[PDB]
């Protein structure tokens, strides 16, 4: 099959990974010098956060030039060496294609805000690149996203004398997508990078492209047709390149972003629905929500693969959970006011699980065992924490912690001169949490993530098998099978903080002996009614092979 | 004497040595271009791993066709050139005869599985080719060999509706040697390759041919009979060709596989008894087990030679050691569960000795100075590592490392496209460990190996002399003599990491000076009671001649 | 006692150790980022090569500003940060003080060469800073040091129309120490850096300060007097700092550079006389030169410590050995013409010993076991090679090799943009020889060197003891004792490539039991008349204590 289903993804921010030149800002030269690290870890595809020239009011998601490299990050030549050194190691690389919007600093917008007509009486073709209103009464009662910052989705441009549309910050004007020229401007941005050998795109904020009155302005089939033709552009001109969608919607809406077999859209979507039910289930010690929402996912096209994740550069989103579930998650996972932002929790993985490695390893094994491809978030494989003294979501985007030398080894410059300060607290700082330390530590989390990704690699049912949940008799225990190519895997996990027991409904498998994927130690044969007793300790994960 | 008595052997796998044409698979044209390297190393006989057509579920030890060349390796023409060119260089070649079993894919088994009688009533002559049972309760309490994969030595064939026998994988059904038609299918399979000029065979899994109730199904007198008739055949139709047995059994059962003068069996068997004791002694700094298992070896026929070896394409086998011996070896040499498989340790020689050249050289000098003919495992002469992310025993069968270019010089294809990934880790990777490196390096393991073989060749007592152990007064120091044709070699070797003192019982040799084989530097003459005091540095090996 | 008697020194070159900003040149930010490496290695004092502003016609030993930081290396703030971080880790630092001469680009010399009298008829105070002759016929019959470049020690200045003196390159005019203003300018250079906290100075080319007619212009009493004044100044104004002298003279004249108890000079001098004899003896397999030269060295003052070294940033100097010894050394260690330069051999340690780790380990242990404090040349602890296609002695100054990524870890710039190109040959290139590789290799030369130093730390008789050579009966075996604080170390070393036997004269120690410093393994007790038989392997080092 396609390369993205066997892939392990790793999300990083070039400005934050390795500063190669002492100026305090990560760049492609330094990132290139770390490529062996990512290779040796068991990563396959690097997803890089936006690398474009930008005033960095949304850390690079306000693009001011789709066709350059931000000067903090080096040059386009540094980009081409990096992509060269990447593929030379067997790694794929995808970028972040910020389609929905541009920075107010983009040349397109500085021209649109002159007016609908120029001072020489000509039409201004750049004015209909964005969505304008005279009073700003359209689409009202539609959801604000950055609720802690923006009081509305319409803001008044003082020089253009009209309101303009923006689903995100005021300085990120929504692009107007009924205009087929804008459709062509981003087809030709996708082309500029796919020409240089880039292996695909993560596509940012796909649900909110088209806006239609009297609807929610999400998942409009008009938006889906823009994606349907983006896929056809790629299918024809750049076969084998990966399109991956950020679609945080409820399960039935999310699969629409794959398309159908006849009309394809995205190869991969992020599994935003299962992500919060992992954390809920851990605090409730009850895995029902994991099975419920996973059963609300319709089957995907042949070419589709889910992208599974635990965290990313954004807050932990609570936009697609019920009001009760959102209230529970604030109570369980956000004790301090400061950890809240925009209907979500802005904390790293390791802090959220109270730095419990037992819980960390648990959710990692479930990330690795659910159907799809996993994406690790840079630094989670060593246990990085966060700095909520930093505004917006930049509390999870601190520099990668390489050693206990200057600035954690991220730069030769001092921590106060780095773009974001490297974390230095007693628990998560780079004196305690860094790569070099965990390569010498025989038992480190880094070693453990590498070993576990090896354990996955060697069992292709993880990447391509089916899922069948299996009754356990205990809500704390979640059991499922993965079948593919006649290998059958049994993946039992305890979500509770003490010893739990269960009766697994292994009736399809009477006469088979489960044995461990690690060490090939055999468990007792399934017999009789197929009801198989287990005890598990707190947060244990049993990874098992059903030998027939 | 016989040619295999003076020979240095070298075990390689065609699929994995050298890829000629760029498709990622080693082949006979590639192997042919490397015969000069092998010649110059000091090697006399190549033993190749199974080259026959095969679905490769045991890396070609599941044979689908005894009279062909697997398409990966080229053609039978390519085979014929290879054997001409090897013979042109004074090299012998022996193949691998997989007698005990064939692949489920072999057209024999596809026929035998259609039942005891044909759809037209007539009896199916191929059915009695394999061993069957209606309930599969026979031969129980017989050892499983691949304990990590197979729950039983019987497996149900869904179409023939009965159980068949297999000492190894379920896709490797045993051949029925009670049926004398099977004995003749292998004689004629042997005849095929001997007719083409091949100089011999290593025979695979010879203890497990015949199975009988109430016995362990190992070293059965019936099995030996079949072997006796195999040597009687070869002795008659193909004098001078070589039969070498893989018989891992305890000292008293292994010597049986030579036969007697009156009734001969193999010319050579692998000296498995001493092999694990070499490693134990290094870890205990106690050379006792070596002398004890060597002492339990009864004298072998005139024509017979032991095949001495440190490692191979299989795990380090812990099947013929005591329970405490086995448990000690796991502790000392398998820190990870990953390192274990099937009552043994799946690791290359250099990793087993922590890449300590001083230890690597020591076991090699003992390999070269024990009585028999040494075999080198391919790549251990430049110190290759292993890859334990690869399943089964594949982790010691990664591609040979010729230089630091694309895929270590094994192929123009990417490492990802090689049949096994060429090792690229910072310690053993082909950037650090390769043949071009070590032909330039004046002191490399490669040149050391070539010189030690050169030194051995100069002293025929190494290949044909007797073995008298000598008292040292220090379990850490192993001392013995070799006596042949008037030469007396004295082989003192320290198995301890620190300096060690010893008093050697050279009472028989009072009046004679010991002198070094290398450099002709004499030690003090032996005098008086001939208790000869010696000091040794860590892992030191003294190769010495006793003057006359 | 004093800190430099217990210190392990480490010689590095900032421009060549670690580049912290991508410009291909090592700098102090970079060197700061590598301080934990040196700390963990067991290094105590960093001797940094000249770091001053200079046109680098002799790699910075032609100084053009004694009170600044060469812009390649960063700023004086960077230097202050480095000194703070070095001291924060218990590391001392010393600089290289180029006393005998400045660059012709030095402000003083641009001034001096204007003439004795300026355009306005008034005299030029800087003319008498340097050594001038009207026809250049003085001090005739005086050695030329840089014989492959310079034809005379007098050169005609174009503008001054006179001859100036230079024991070195013509772009390094000798300072004139009969002028007392000169003497004050270098007390003043000393004070500047000694005021920033620098712990001392390696003093360059100290024998050749004062020149006098009718002498060799070496080791003259007037030169020693200026050095006594330099010691007096530091003794009073900066107690506790280190003056270390580079004086390669014959054993008699070397010891003068310590001064007397009453009129002290240098705290330490390099033990140049012994350095070639270590190499002579390894090739002859006869250690009498080691003993003869060590015994021509008179006792040193109470404050004196020797500095022992195998190699450095220069050539292996053959200036102070006989004509026959020098011809031998050329035959043994300079097969190619390209390997000689000015009475000496310009190769790194590992190439000199054919990359034989047995011989590298032997001479390193003698380095650690002779009387003195040891200085390690950077990269020798990982086995770095040389690049003899670079001019002068730069072949041994190639960038440190850290990992196997871009430029070996030395810089993110490409190798072709690095000040000197990092080695990439198949034997010594950073793809085979680098720090990260050798941290993962359980048996690397780096770990060996670390552990051998730790062994040395544990036994103060190495730093502080006396030395008595011990008869052996075999010139290939060098045996001596180190006695201090009633601890008695016996050190035995074989300089030949085969086994060697000998009879240690241990009469002073009858009744004592020798044990290995590593492992505490006992040799037999000395009995009888203390004539102790020993056998050694090739290049063995027995490191023994005599248990009382
Ligand atoms: O509901 C999904 C989300 C989308 C949005 N994430 C993407 C779109 C935004 C475009 O400017 C950007 O801030 C964010 O980093 C992107 O990954 C939003 O910011 C998140 O808070 C939120 O969890
Ligand atoms: O008891 C000795 C052994 C025999 C077996 N080795 C041979 C039998 C198998 C036949 O299919 C084959 O996999 C293996 O490579 C052969 O050399 C076994 O696999 C080993 O693990 C083991 O050391
Ligand atoms: O006689 C000993 C030596 C001193 C000299 N070494 C120092 C003096 C030179 C001063 O310019 C300089 O080139 C060298 O690096 C210094 O360490 C000479 O250049 C060497 O070749 C030689 O080994
Ligand atoms: Ca939009
Ligand atoms: Ca059988
Ligand atoms: Ca002078
Ligand atoms: Mg930068
Ligand atoms: Mg091929
Ligand atoms: Mg620099």
Identify the CATH number of the domain in which residue A156 sits. Answer: 3.90.400.10
H or E, element range at B487: strand B487-494
Phi, psi of B533 (to 5 degrees): -75, 140
- What is the rounded distance in angstroms from the CA atom of residue A360 to the CA atom of residue A432? 17
Q: Which chains touch B (3 or more CB pairs under 8 A)?
A: A, C
Q: Which residues pair with C489 in a beta bridge?
A: C482, C545
Size of interface A-B (CB pairs under 8 A): 22
Active-site annotation holds for B246: yes
Q: Which residues pair with C501 in a beta bridge?
A: C535
H or E, element range at C10: strand C9-12
Extract the runs of DSSP E, i.e. beta strands, from B356-450: 373-377
Q: What is the 3-state secondary structure (H, E, C) of C226-248?
A: HHHHHHHHHHHHCCCCEEEECCC
B436 to C442: CB separation less than 8 angstroms, yes or no: no
State whether A279 and A412 are in the same domain: yes
Residue of A nearest to C22 (CA): A21
- Which of C441, C537, C542 is closest, CB to CB, to B355? C441
Within 8 A of B540 by CB-CB distance, chain C residues are 537, 540
Nearest ligand 1 atom, CA A58: 13
DSSP state at residue C421: P
Q: Is B489 helix (H, G, I), strand (E, B) or coil?
A: strand
**The pair of three-digit structure tokens given for residue B403, joined into one six-digit string:** 């230089």
Residue C222, marked binder: no
Domain count, chain B: 3
Binding-site residue positions of A for Mg(2+)? 19, 21, 23, 25, 27
**The pair of three-digit structure tokens given for residue B232, joined into one six-digit string:** 């009687």
> Mutate which of A61, A208, A250 to test ligand 1's pocket (most atoms within 8 Å of Cβ)?
A61
- The tally of CA atoms less than 13 A away on the side-chain side of residue C166 is 25
In contact, B481 and B506? CB cutoff 8 Å: no
Within 10 A of C79 (CB to CB), how many other CB atoms are there? Answer: 24
State whether C106 and C228 are in the same domain: no
- What is the rounded distance in angstroms from the CA atom of residue C121 to the CA atom of residue C129? 19
Core vs surface per residue B198-212: b (16+ CB within 10 A) or e:
bbbbbbbbbbbbbbe
Q: Is C281 helix (H, G, I), strand (E, B) or coil?
A: helix
Residues in chain A, total? 548
Strands across the sheet with C163-165, in order?
Answer: C132-133, C163-165, C154-156
- Which of C20, C406, C440 is closest, CB to CB, to A22? C20
Please give the distance, rounded to the nearest whole angstrom, from the Cα atom of residue A403 to the centre of ligand 7. Answer: 18
Who's near C168: CB < 8 A, 6+ residues apart?
C58, C61, C100, C101, C145, C146, C150, C205
Q: Residues B62, B157, B204, B387: which is the catalytic one?
A: B204
Alpha-carbon gap: A311 to the closest alpha carbon of chain B (Å) = 27
CA distances from residue C89 to A408, A410, C32, C34, C85 in whole angstroms, order as listed? 17, 21, 11, 12, 7
CA-wise closest residue to B346 among B309, B404, B385, B375: B385
Q: Residues A138, A246, A265, A540: which is the catalytic one?
A: A246
Residue of C nearest to B352 (CA): C442
Nearest protein Cα to ligand 1, atom 5: A205
Extract the runs of DSSP E, i.e. beta strands, from B344-409: 344-345, 373-377
- Which of B357, B434, B536 is closest, CB to CB, to C537? B536
Bridge pairing between strands A373-377 and A344-345: unpaired
Q: Residues A204, A265, A381, A386: which is the catalytic one?
A: A204
What is the separation, in whole angstroms, between the first and last Cα of chain B? 25
- What is the rounded distance in angstroms from the CA atom of residue C249 to the CA atom of residue C321? 10
State whether C195 and C182 are in the same domain: yes
State whether A229 and A310 are in the same domain: yes
Residues after which chain C is broken (C–N above 2.5 A) are none
Q: Is A202 helix (H, G, I), strand (E, B) or coil?
A: strand
Q: What is the 3-state secondary structure (H, E, C) of B34-85?
A: CHHHHHHHCCCEEEECCCCCCCCCCCCCCCCCCCCCCHHHCCHHHHHHHHHH
- What is the rounded distance in angstroms from the CA atom of residue A191 to the CA atom of residue A269? 21
Q: Is B224 helix (H, G, I), strand (E, B) or coil?
A: helix
Nearest protein Cα to ligand 1, atom 19: A314
CATH number where A27 lies: 3.20.20.80
Q: How far is CA C72 from the centre of its chain?
A: 23
Within 10 A of C485 (CB to CB), how many other CB atoms are there? Answer: 10
Who's near C472: CB < 8 A, 6+ residues apart?
C478, C479, C492, C502, C503, C504, C505
A32 to C404: CB separation less than 8 angstroms, yes or no: no
**The pair of three-digit structure tokens given for residue C225, joined into one six-digit string:** 């007097």
Q: What angle do CA C439, C441, C444 make, to 5 degrees?
A: 85
In contact, C201 and C186? CB cutoff 8 Å: no
C33 to A404: CB separation less than 8 angstroms, yes or no: no
State whether A29 and A163 are in the same domain: no
Alpha-carbon gap: A518 to the closest alpha carbon of chain B (Å) = 7
Q: Residues B11, B59, B72, B246: which is the catalytic one?
A: B246
- Which of A36, A405, A440 is closest, CB to CB, to C405? A36
Burial class (CB in 10 A: 0-12, 13-18, 19+), A356: middle
In contact, B347 and B297? CB cutoff 8 Å: no
State whether C201 and C317 are in the same domain: yes
Does residue B96 have its Cβ closer than 6 Å to ligand 2? no
State whether A362 and A502 are in the same domain: no
- Which of C404, C535, C544 is closest, CB to CB, to B431? C404
In contact, A360 and A352? CB cutoff 8 Å: no
Q: Is C200 helix (H, G, I), strand (E, B) or coil?
A: strand
State whether B186 and B166 are in the same domain: no
Please give the distance, rounded to the nearest whole angstrom, from the Cα atom of residue A74 to the centre of ligand 7. Answer: 7
Q: Which residues pair with B478 in a beta bridge?
A: B493
CA-wise closest residue to A10 among A385, A346, A373: A373
In the structure, ligand 6 is a single-atom ion and the residues with CB under 5 Å from it are: C 100, 174, 209
Strands across the sheet with B514-516, in order?
Answer: B468-470, B477-484, B487-494, B541-546, B514-516
Who's near C518: CB < 8 A, 6+ residues apart?
B497, B498, C455, C543
- Among residues B158, B176, B194, the one where a domain terminates is B176
- What is the rounded distance in angstroms from the CA atom of residue C236 to the CA atom of residue A222? 87
Q: Which residues pair with A502 in a beta bridge?
A: A534
> Mutate which of A63, A174, A205 to test ligand 1's pocket (most atoms within 8 Å of Cβ)?
A205
State whether A547 and A527 are in the same domain: yes
Who's near B394: CB < 8 A, 6+ residues apart?
B59, B387, B420
B151 to A513: CB separation less than 8 angstroms, yes or no: yes
- Among residues A432, A464, A496, the one where a domain terminates is A464
Experimental approach was: X-ray
Burial class (CB in 10 A: 0-12, 13-18, 19+), B5: middle
Within 8 A of C282 by CB-CB distance, chain B residues are none
Please give the distance, rounded to the nearest whole angstrom, from the Cα atom of residue A301 to the centre of ligand 1. Answer: 26
Within 10 A of C421 (CB to CB), how many other CB atoms are there? Answer: 17
Does residue A361 have its Cβ closer than 6 Å to ligand 1? no
State whether B449 and B531 are in the same domain: no
State whether B166 and B208 are in the same domain: no
A519 to B337: CB separation less than 8 angstroms, yes or no: yes
In the structure, ligand 7 is a single-atom ion and the residues with CB under 5 Å from it are: A 19, 21, 23, 25, 27
**The pair of three-digit structure tokens given for residue B44, joined into one six-digit string:** 């006399």
Within 8 A of C423 by CB-CB distance, chain B residues are none
Who's near C463: CB < 8 A, 6+ residues apart?
C5, C6, C373, C456
Within 8 A of A412 by CB-CB distance, chain C residues are 20-21, 29-30, 32-33
State whether C211 and C342 are in the same domain: yes
Who's near B227: CB < 8 A, 6+ residues apart?
B206, B209, B245, B257, B259, B265, B266
Please give the distance, rounded to the nearest whole angstrom, from the Cα atom of residue C66 to the centre of ligand 9. Answer: 21
A520 to B341: CB separation less than 8 angstroms, yes or no: yes
CATH number where C470 lies: 2.60.40.1180
Q: Residues C62, C78, C150, C204: which is the catalytic one?
A: C204
- Among residues B176, B203, B224, the one where a domain terminates is B176
**What string of DSSP letters covers C402-414?**
--SSGGGGT-SS-
Within 8 A of A36 by CB-CB distance, chain C residues are 403-405
CA distances from residue A352 to A316, A334, A347 in whole angstroms, order as listed? 10, 8, 6
Domain hosting A51: range is: 1-100+177-464
- What is the rounded distance in angstroms from the CA atom of residue B6 to the CA atom of residue B372? 9
Active-site annotation holds for B150: no
């Amino acid at each position: 099959p396609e390369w993205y289903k066997s892939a392990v993804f790793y999300e990083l921010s070039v400005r934050t990974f390795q500063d190669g030149n002492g100026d305090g800002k990560g760049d492609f030269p330094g990132l290139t010098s770390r490529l062996d690290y990512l290779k040796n870890l068991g990563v396959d595809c690097l997803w890089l956060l936006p690398w474009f020239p930008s005033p960095l009011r949304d850390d690079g998601y306000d693009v001011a030039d789709y066709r350059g490299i931000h000067p903090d990050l080096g040059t386009l030549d540094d980009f081409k060496v990096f992509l060269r050194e990447a593929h030379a190691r067997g790694l794929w690389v995808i970028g972040d294609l910020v389609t929905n919007h541009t920075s107010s600093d983009h040349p397109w917008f500085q021209a649109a805000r002159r007016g609908p007509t120029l001072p020489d009486g000509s039409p201004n073709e750049y004015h209909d690149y964005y969505v304008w209103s005279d009073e700003g009464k359209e689409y009202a009662d539609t959801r604000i996203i950055f609720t802690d910052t923006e009081v509305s989705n319409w803001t008044l441009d003082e020089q253009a004398g009209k309101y303009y549309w923006h689903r995100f910050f005021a300085s990120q004007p929504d692009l107007n997508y009924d205009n087929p020229k804008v459709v062509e401007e981003l087809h030709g941005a996708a082309r500029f990078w796919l020409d240089l050998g880039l292996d695909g795109f993560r596509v940012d904020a796909v649900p909110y492209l088209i806006e239609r009155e009297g609807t929610s302005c999400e998942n409009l089939p008009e938006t889906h047709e823009i994606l349907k033709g983006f896929r056809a552009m790629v299918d024809r001109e750049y076969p084998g390149r990966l399109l991956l969608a950020e679609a945080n919607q409820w399960p039935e809406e999310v699969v629409e972003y794959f398309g159908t077999e006849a009309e394809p859209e995205f190869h991969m979507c992020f599994n935003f629905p299962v992500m919060p039910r992992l954390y809920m289930s851990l605090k409730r010690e009850d895995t029902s929500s994991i099975r419920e929402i996973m059963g609300r996912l319709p089957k995907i096209p042949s070419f589709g693969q889910w992208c599974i994740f635990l965290r990313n550069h954004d807050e932990l989103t609570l936009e697609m959970v019920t009001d009760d579930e959102r209230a529970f998650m604030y109570a369980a996972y956000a004790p301090d006011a400061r950890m809240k932002i925009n209907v979500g929790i802005r904390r790293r993985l390791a802090p959220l699980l109270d730095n419990d490695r037992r819980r960390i390893e648990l959710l990692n094994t479930v990330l690795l065992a659910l159907p799809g491809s996993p994406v690790l978030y840079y630094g989670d494989e060593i246990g990085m924490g966060d700095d909520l003294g930093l505004p917006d979501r930049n509390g999870v985007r601190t520099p990668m912690q390489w050693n206990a030398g200057t600035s954690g080894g991220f730069s030769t410059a001092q921590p106060s001169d780095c773009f974001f300060p490297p974390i230095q607290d007693p628990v998560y700082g780079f004196g305690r949490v860094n790569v070099q330390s965990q390569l010498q530590d025989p038992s480190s989390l880094l070693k453990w993530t590498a070993r576990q990704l090896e354990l996955r690699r060697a069992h292709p049912a993880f990447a391509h098998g089916d899922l069948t949940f299996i009754e356990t008799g205990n809500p704390a225990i979640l059991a499922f099978t993965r079948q593919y190519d006649g290998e059958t895997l049994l993946i039992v996990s305890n979500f509770a903080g003490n010893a739990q027991a269960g009766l697994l409904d292994l009736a399809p498998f009477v006469g088979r002996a489960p044995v461990t994927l690690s060490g090939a130690s055999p468990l007792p044969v399934v017999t009789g009614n197929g009801q198989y007793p287990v005890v598990m300790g707190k947060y244990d994960y049993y990874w098992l092979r059903l030998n027939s």
